[PDB]
Every structure is written in C-alpha cells, then in structure tokens.
Design a protein around this ligand. Structure first.
Ligand SMILES: [Ca+2]
Length: 201
C-alpha cells in the first residue's frame, strides 16, 4: 500500500467551464474515481487557494474522502493560487509508518501566482515523496462564471478575467517532483494513469 495526499486547487479560476462541467467539478469526479479505484492505499486531501488546509488527514476510509468532495466550498478558503504551500503542507502530512510509499497528487489549472512550487516539488522528491500533477482546463482560455449572475469575474480595471491551463508550469512541477503530468480530459483515463504511476511506490 501507498499513502496518497491529494492537493486540490479550489481557487476561483477552477470555476472556469472550459472543461465540463467545470475544472473544479471535473477534478472532484477524478478524485472520486481515484479513491474508488484504491484497495490497499491510504488517502488524504488538502484544498488550497492562497493558502492550503488539510480537510482529510490520511485515512483508509475512501468513502469519507468522496463525501468531503460534496461539501467543497470555494466561497470559504485567502484567495489566490499557492501550489508550493500546498506541496509543502502535503509533504508534512504523511504517517511515520515505516517503509511506505508516499505520493502527492496536485490537481490544478497550474495558474500559479506565487513562486516556489518547483522548489517545493524538488524538496519533496529529494526526500522520496513523489509529486504528480493533474492539469485541468484548456490552454486556450475561458472566463470565470459567477453563480447566480450572467457575468464573469473581472479584474480591477473591469475587464473579464481569462484563465488558461498553464501546462509548462505543471510539467516542470511533475518533472522536479519525480512524478508524472497528465492533462485531464477523460477523468476515468487520467485516473488509471495516476493509479498506474502510484502503484510503483
Ligand atoms: Ca487559480
């Protein structure tokens, strides 16, 4: 068995709907598939935007993990995007259990704002903790819809924000984390590939 810490981006850009039904909802279904495909592993979950928090400590209760997905609330996280902080928190969140594989799975559009994500991945992998990245979204660009509104999120100048999958950043994080990068399209297929990479730990 391997210990797997999910780090899920719940920042505002994840509400973009360039992938159906949104980046966040696609990510939630991927996590659900991922845990339903576990047998011997343990799983935990961190959510992050401007800061990172552990919702679910590492556990054998896969079903509990699925339940946390239903209550995810981007309305209730500091705003922003802090992948490095999430990796750092994840790296310190595994059990001391002797000789067990440890893997971090970051799920994000990679629109990182802060620096240090690559350095965090390097630190993690140096210590033996693999960092994988599942990129959700498209590189083209989509706006961010506001629930109960016909409008989209705007910047300080009043223009519509366009958010894009930052593939280069996600790929570099996975590389330095000794892990894999997958651009998520078929969530069931992405799930198999990540389980396949994890099952070498
Ligand atoms: Ca973001």
């Amino acid at each position: 068995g391997v210990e797997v810490m999910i780090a899920l981006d719940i920042s505002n850009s994840m509400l973009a709907q360039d992938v159906q039904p949104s980046r966040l909802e696609k990510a939630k279904r991927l996590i659900s598939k991922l845990v339903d495909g576990m047998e011997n592993d343990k799983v935990g979950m961190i959510v992050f935007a401007g800061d990172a928090f552990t919702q679910l400590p590492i556990t054998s209760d896969y079903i509990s993990a699925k339940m946390f997905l239903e209550s995810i609330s981007p309305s209730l996280i500091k705003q922003g995007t802090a992948i490095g902080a999430a990796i750092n928190l994840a790296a310190r969140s595994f059990t001391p259990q002797e000789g067990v594989g440890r893997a971090i799975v970051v799920i994000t559009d990679g629109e990182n704002h802060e620096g240090g994500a690559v350095a965090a991945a390097k630190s993690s992998s140096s210590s033996g903790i693999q960092v994988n990245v599942l990129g959700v979204g498209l590189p083209d660009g989509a706006p961010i819809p506001i629930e109960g509104s016909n409008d989209f999120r705007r910047d300080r100048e009043g223009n519509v924000i366009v958010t894009r999958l930052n593939e280069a950043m996600c790929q570099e994080i996975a590389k330095e984390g000794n892990g894999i990068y997958i651009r998520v399209d078929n969530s069931n297929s992405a799930q198999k590939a990540i389980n396949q990479e994890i099952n070498k730990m």
